[PDB]
């Protein structure tokens, strides 16, 4: 029943071309830096947390800065949380007080200042919104929540779910061109299977408001009438390591997130940050299953971006400079996921990742396919290679130990 | 720390537009019926709900889109400026906001502005929306200058409907019509004997970049461009120059684009069909250029709903000039050597167009010191243009005293 409109449908395309966004965690819960996830984990009441509020002042925040340290990884969008399941407005909100502008000493909409930063920079701005609430009285209680003290653990769902569309619609109107609304915390009522969630209003909410908005919700199902993308929670299309989304994979664009340390908010302890050569890899097989790369920094209550990250993010995007032309605009490749690598494709350009590769040859399963050409993608240095009866095999001058070598294939 | 920051998709767009250099203004509405200009309402204190009235006697029956945008695409115009809904306040579009409209409220039943978007798309037209800030004809509509003498009840308006009118109207037409170049305000002027009229600007223009980040945000107000636009307008006259009278603003760095008519109207005027000569059509087109403008050239359809004959051919010669000269406007600034006399320059690449229009001599001075011009040539045939340089700038010696429209030496610089 839903039609995407001509708008959305390019938006889709240009998401895909993107390939690549930064996820910003940042609520109050920054400063207890111990995780978003604190005031279930530790049964904190509810107008306890709140008075942490008055004392949140992130002094060192430059929008400009995160999103010029952004734009230097060579991420195309951003991805922030306007509000997580503590409860907390990010923006200037009329439908509550409890929002960084009223409640805080910082009296500032950091919701507006990085989306002035975004136009300036050329980085499309993501909405991340929490269908869950641990804070309000009239939210509903699901798996979560239960020890916040609130007194109605029934909420007043006609009450709640007004304030999330007025709040919606403050987010795609106050707020210039947004490129997707991603909901989260379906999963929080996945004991009560006729959980109501009206999700077809509200969608059609987000593209009455801008047609070419892209609504994604993180529930791990196959994807609901007018959802325009298909998350996967730190797992990989098809594929459930964490156990988080081992679900179908389908006809709209793919995403899948990850941390580049242990955590989504900031977390004290954790200053464990992956290698780039992990987080290339992270993008690089993503891109290789048709899927975006959602990498997520936790921003300190300071105000900063962490300084690893910065620097992590600098260090892929100098990867970027020189082999962006492998993942931007490509989609999932010919050749699937191997042991070695993966490929992405765009137009006749067939590029075969080669990430982790013990000899100095490589057995691809290309088999009705002529391939016309292969060379180095760095120099275009001619590779070799022979017809077998099961596809081709690529010599290759060395036994590859790059971060990531390049093989360019023409095929027709 | 500027509050405005023209999106990548925005600054992409402005360029596209000075490079598309050509515009077709339509000035269409109840007003052709009367055929006496689209200010008679105004000029001749007409009773709002007796000139309604007309709606119903308005039935424009040779109305053909496609032959329309065709006859423009002919002349080498690359974009068309129609008038969705002019001061006279008739919407010329299917609107849920007003029952006043070519569809509801006359006996031709039909979206013309649908009609002329799908046949801008089919032919590969951009279409820009002019929408007047101003009404003769809503009781909610506060009165400036004009519009005083209609009969209306309340001189002071309601702003608050009335705003939310607009902005409902401008949010139907980048919704229901495709991709959208520009839209294009008029009316400002209007209120400039109230120092203190609060148009809320910057929330209109956002609501505008909200959805359609590339659509180009023009207001025709006379002065130092607001926050939040994208080109800058100057009415009847080239950039810096005054000669109507309705031009002392200060030129901006955004895009530039002037408009004027083919004969002396906006809207159809039975009396007015005196047209301008095509060669005079092509040096408004060629000066425009030369000043790093856009023009923009009115034509009045007529209540049948045929664009007039005359102005048809004139656009058909105009384009026959621009199959061979097409090249020194289309993608081309506004030149290194600033308009003279005898002409302008424009400027592509490594190229500088040389368009002498008005020429009485066999040579030309041209002020060209810093940089080295390493050839010259007849744009035309590439036929070499013999020059020598003299301390302020180099002499082209022609082959004759030029008589044609405009006789294009093609210089290549470094
Ligand atoms: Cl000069
Ligand atoms: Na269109």
């Known amino acids: 029943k839903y039609q995407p409109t001509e708008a959305n449908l390019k938006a889709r395309s240009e998401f895909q071309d993107n390939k690549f966004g930064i996820f910003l965690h940042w609520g109050l819960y920054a400063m207890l830096a111990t995780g978003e996830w604190t005031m279930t984990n530790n049964n904190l009441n509810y107008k306890e947390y709140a008075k942490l509020a008055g004392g949140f002042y992130p002094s060192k925040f430059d929008a400009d800065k995160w999103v010029a340290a952004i734009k230097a990884s060579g991420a195309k969008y951003i991805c922030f949380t306007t509000r997580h399941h503590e409860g907390f407005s990010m923006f ?26 975004c136009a300036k920079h050329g980085i499309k701005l993501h909405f991340y919104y929490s269908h869950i609430d641990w804070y309000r009285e009239d939210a509903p209680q699901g798996r979560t929540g239960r020890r916040t003290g609130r007194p109605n653990p029934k909420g007043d769902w006609k009450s709640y779910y007004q304030f999330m569309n007025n709040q919606l619609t403050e987010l795609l109107t106050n707020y210039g061109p947004i490129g997707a609304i991603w909901f989260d915390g379906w999963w929080d009522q996945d004991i009560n299977p006729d959980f109501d969630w009206e999700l077809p209003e509200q969608y059609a909410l ?23 993308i298909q998350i996967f929670e730190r797992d990989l299309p098809g594929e459930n390591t964490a156990g988080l989304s081992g679900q179908s994979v389908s006809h709209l664009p793919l995403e899948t997130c990850e941390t580049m340390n242990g955590m989504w908010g900031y977390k004290i302890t954790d200053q464990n940050y992956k290698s780039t050569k992990t987080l290339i890899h992270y993008l690089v097989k993503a891109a290789g299953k048709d899927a975006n790369l959602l990498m997520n920094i936790g921003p300190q209550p300071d105000g900063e971006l ?29 050749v699937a996921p191997h042991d070695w690598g993966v490929t992405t494709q765009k137009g006749n350009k067939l590029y075969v990742h080669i990430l982790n590769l013990q000899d100095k040859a490589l057995f691809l399963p290309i088999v009705d396919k002529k391939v016309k050409k292969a060379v180095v993608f760095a120099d275009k240095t001619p590779v070799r290679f022979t017809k077998n009866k099961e596809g081709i095999v690529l010599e290759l001058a060395k036994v590859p130990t790059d971060v990531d070598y390049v093989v360019e294939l023409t095929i027709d």
């Open 206 to 228: 987000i593209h009455r408001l801008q047609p070419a908005c892209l609504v994604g919700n993180n529930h791990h199902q196959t994807p609901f009438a007018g959802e325009d």
């Open 306 to 334: 962490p300084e690893v990250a910065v620097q992590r993010l600098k260090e892929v995007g100098e990867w970027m400079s020189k082999y962006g032309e492998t993942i931007y605009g490509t989609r999932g490749g010919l």
């Open 92 to 117: 200037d909100t009329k439908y509550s007080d409890y929002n960084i502008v009223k409640a805080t000493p910082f009296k500032r909409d950091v919701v507006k200042e990085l989306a002035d930063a």
